[PDB]
Write a protein that binds this ligand. Structure first.
Ligand SMILES: [Zn+2]
Length: 46
C-alpha cells in the first residue's frame, strides 16, 4: 500500500515481481533475490 500521488520521481528500475521501486539496477536485482529461486508449485501458478 503506497501513498502520495504527486512526487513519484524517476524509478525505471521497479521490481515487476512484487511492484517495488528502485533508482539503481543493482538495487533492483539485489532485491529480486527474494523472488528468484522459489517458484509456484501445483497445477497452476496463479
Ligand atoms: Zn520484489
Amino acid at each position: 500500500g503506497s501513498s502520495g500521488s504527486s512526487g513519484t520521481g524517476e524509478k525505471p528500475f521497479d521490481c515487476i515481481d512484487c511492484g517495488k521501486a528502485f533508482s539503481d539496477h543493482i538495487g533492483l536485482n539485489q532485491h529480486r533475490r527474494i523472488h528468484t529461486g522459489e517458484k509456484p508449485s501445483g497445477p497452476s501458478s496463479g
